């Protein structure tokens, strides 16, 4: 998931979307 | 002259709180055996006996070595 381009802020904002969807 | 009498009284009282000594006008208060907490307690005995408050630049070794220099203290106001 990091080879994609996700940095720490990107990953933080990513945990936020998943906790949100379900 | 009443001042000198009741000053020597508080000194002899704080001195009697630990030891005993001869109190002279020309004698230095440190030689008598006055410690810091003593000089503190002696300042509070002088301010309570004559109900005044010792002011600025008057809390000095000059004005506080001998009762004879504590003369010019109480008797400056």
């Amino acid at each position: 998931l990091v080879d994609v381009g996700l940095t720490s802020m990107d990953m933080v904002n990513l945990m936020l979307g998943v906790e949100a969807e379900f | 002259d009443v001042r000198n009498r009741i000053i020597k009284l508080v000194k002899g009282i704080l001195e009697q709180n630990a030891l005993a000594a001869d109190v002279t006008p020309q004698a230095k208060l440190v030689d008598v055996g006055l410690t810091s907490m003593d000089m503190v307690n002696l300042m509070l005995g002088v301010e309570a006996e004559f109900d005044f408050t010792i002011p600025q630049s008057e809390i000095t070794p000059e004005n506080f070595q001998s009762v004879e220099t504590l003369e010019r203290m109480v008797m400056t106001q």
């Binding site: 720490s8 990953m11 933080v12 | -």
Partner: protein
């Protein structure tokens, strides 16, 4: 705990977990470790020594509150009037709490040695080609009380910091990762180097650590003290990317926001690792280790 037996020879209790007085023996080894590190300093490296305190505003700007607000020690004092301060003292005399009269100063206890170096560097204008290199040290503080001799609240850190293009910084850390292992090896130490993360505060921070490990921004030289399953990080190798360049507006020689990185030596952990490995009797230390240290 496996390190507890070293206390009698190395430390005296100062009445607070993680805060110890240091014996002549212990300090002699910290000193020799420091001299050894110095002897490996790259050429063109500017050396600065920091006090144990730093500007609170500078640390706030650096984002320390976003990462480790639970570790920060702030400096506070009685800033009031003579009457207020006397009342504070009076409560103390009565056996009450004078500390309620405390208010924050504009200072914190430095949590890491390198923080104050970025604004200093930034005040110099654009970086030369090849960036800048600093040798920094400080007594740091982290509010994490522990009885373990390898987890202190007050401890010496020593760092080499690199500011420059991404290549200058990556190459820098590459050199040091190799060099640090050669050092540990010459010290007769057992270690491995591994990916790590800083202990970011909160659940949000838990994810920052994951991404930090994943981006491989942090390595640690890990030494088995108490157990080989639970080794102690005695050195770290840190890539910050443009984080500090951006924050302090440092420009590399190509107009772009500078990258930064640092190599950190935990002086007290290294010294404890030395005494744990070789013992408290210096005459018995291996000949090669005694030599490397100039004993």
């Amino acid at each position: 705990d496996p390190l507890d037996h070293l206390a009698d020879k190395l430390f005296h209790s100062m009445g607070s977990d993680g805060v110890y007085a240091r014996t002549a023996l212990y300090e002699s080894i910290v000193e020799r470790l420091a001299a050894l590190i110095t002897s490996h300093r790259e050429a063109g490296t500017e050396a600065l020594r920091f006090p144990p305190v730093m500007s609170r505003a500078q640390l706030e700007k650096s984002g320390y509150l976003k990462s480790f607000p639970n570790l920060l020690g702030c400096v506070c004092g009685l800033h009031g009037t003579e009457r207020e301060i006397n009342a504070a003292v009076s409560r103390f005399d009565a056996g009450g709490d004078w500390t309620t009269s405390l208010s924050p100063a504009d200072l914190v206890l430095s949590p890491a040695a390198c923080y104050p170096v970025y604004p200093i560097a930034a005040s110099r204008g654009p970086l030369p080609k090849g960036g800048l290199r600093f040798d920094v040290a400080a007594d740091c503080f982290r509010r994490e009380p522990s009885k373990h001799l390898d987890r202190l609240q007050s401890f010496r850190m020593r760092e080499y910091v690199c500011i420059g293009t991404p290549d200058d910084v990556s190459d820098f850390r590459e050199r040091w990762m190799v060099r640090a292992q050669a050092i540990a090896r010459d010290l007769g130490l057992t270690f491995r180097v591994d990916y790590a993360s800083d202990p970011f505060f909160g659940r949000v921070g838990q994810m920052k650590a994951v991404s930090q490990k994943q981006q491989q921004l942090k390595f640690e030289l890990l030494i088995p003290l108490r157990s080989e399953e639970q080794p102690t990080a005695c050195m770290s190798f840190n890539y910050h990317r443009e984080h500090f360049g951006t924050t302090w507006g440092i420009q590399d020689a190509n107009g772009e926001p500078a990258h930064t990185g640092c190599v950190a030596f935990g002086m007290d952990r290294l010294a404890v690792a030395m005494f744990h490995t070789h013992g408290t009797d210096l005459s018995a230390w291996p000949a090669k280790v005694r030599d490397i240290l100039g004993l």
